[PDB]
Swiss-Prot record:
Name under which the protein is recorded: Spliceosome associated factor 3, U4/U6 recycling protein
Originating species: Homo sapiens
Coiled coil: 1-21
Job description of the protein: U6 snRNP-binding protein that functions as a recycling factor of the splicing machinery. Promotes the initial reassembly of U4 and U6 snRNPs following their ejection from the spliceosome during its maturation. Also binds U6atac snRNPs and may function as a recycling factor for U4atac/U6atac spliceosomal snRNP, an initial step in the assembly of U12-type spliceosomal complex. The U12-type spliceosomal complex plays a role in the splicing of introns with non-canonical splice sites. May also function as a substrate-targeting factor for deubiquitinases like USP4 and USP15. Regulates Tat transactivation activity through direct interaction. May be a cellular factor for HIV-1 gene expression and viral replication.
Tissue-level expression: Ubiquitously expressed.
Amino acid sequence: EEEKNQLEIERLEEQLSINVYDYNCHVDLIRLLRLEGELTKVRMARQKMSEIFPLTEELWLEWLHDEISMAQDGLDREHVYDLFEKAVKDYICPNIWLEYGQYSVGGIGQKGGLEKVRSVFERALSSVGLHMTKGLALWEAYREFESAIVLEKVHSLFRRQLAIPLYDMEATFAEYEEWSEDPIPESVIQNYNKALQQLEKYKPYEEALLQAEAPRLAEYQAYIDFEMKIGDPARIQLIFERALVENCLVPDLWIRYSQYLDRQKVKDLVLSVHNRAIRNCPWTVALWSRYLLAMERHG
Ligand SMILES: [Cl-]
């Protein structure tokens, strides 16, 4: 069935030359070639797809996994890091960050390898460390890394985490008590209580998301309203980003994120968000207008 396959490879290719904006054709084309072992054409197809489209976490991770295995030396490794840097730009991506962290720990023996690992985890925590269901895996991964080389930094990460509302933060408090020789300070006990209060406050909104059907737009918009009432810029940014993972083809959501950012010392953030907006909703003239106004405003 090689001739059968090659025929449908050529058909999909012709269909892409007819219309490059056919997402499923790209995916179908790439799926074949990975099985067929045409490693060169798979990489080229992935490169071309990723120029045209923002990719989901799953699509990125399939690519990254193949490239990790094929990387043999320090230079190949750097090109894999370049691929991670491209990968993390599209949407918030806790699993890509976890894999970036693990790959970096794999390269610990590179010169500067320790700094690279800590940079990766700190950057991950900056993006997803407040994520109520998915942030905890990154705090735990970072603590397991820091433990495996000591141990004040592990105290730091327990205490930093416990100031933040996350699911299973009760278990982390118990863990920290049992782990710590000394007892936990009062300030950290006080912030933990404040964080538990926050957690309870957010629980109805999280439950609404989990209960509602995908892509749960109304439940996201209500959560966004709620966080915008509360006013923490990091939290507002996070909820927009969570909503956009599932609602990336909704121009109104990007526009709302853009309006919020028009009221902010954050040039790099503003311009990266607008680029992502036009990659996801390229037919929306208002988003292109907004992107160019933002560039002028920040020039
Ligand atoms: Cl880095």
